[PDB]
Amino acid sequence: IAKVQCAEVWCPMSPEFYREYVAIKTKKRILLYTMNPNKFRACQFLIKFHERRNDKIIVFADNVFALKEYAIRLNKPYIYGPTSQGERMQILQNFKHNPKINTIFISKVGDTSFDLPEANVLIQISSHGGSRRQEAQRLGRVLRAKKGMVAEEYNAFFYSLVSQDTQEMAYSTKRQRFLVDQGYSFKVITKLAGMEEEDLAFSTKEEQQQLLQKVLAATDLDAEEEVVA
What we know:
monomer, 229 residues, alpha/beta, Rossmann fold, seven-stranded parallel sheet, 8 helices, 7 strands
């Protein structure tokens, strides 16, 4: 069946982002480790790497502010709570059947339930308190073997992006233990081989400062997970 490589990708906090992360005490600070430009660049690189292999990729964001900043910047479709049934089905049908559209962004509305589509790669932008078990379930529902690499060691991929020096790390020793105990191959990636051969966003300090201003303008409400019933 699907043979899944699980990885955490540890990304340093930009010093400007780390500065504010410390100073801010309300849940607003979650947005600084979520929008950290090193983490965005890692996500962007992974989408490029996998799209070159014609893999299908779902990127999960539990936070709507982040869902849009990522998807719109990377020019990928996104689905969340207020997305109409018609537009949602357009996007899912595109993901499933149109070879030009192989990456989509989905929020907490994905699990569960509408019918999560199948993909070969699942990237989680965030990690939080506290459901290790909902993570593995979603991984399981989404990930299917890329056909046909039956020879290959891994044919599907899960990545969880973690910001260093933030509360995100605490969730890591936990996730690693849980996933391996569940029978998964798991590793920690601190440096993505050859990100410097790609043209990624936020290469300049000024670009990062633009995003930083936008994050600082957000409120504690913007840093809450999307809730849905």
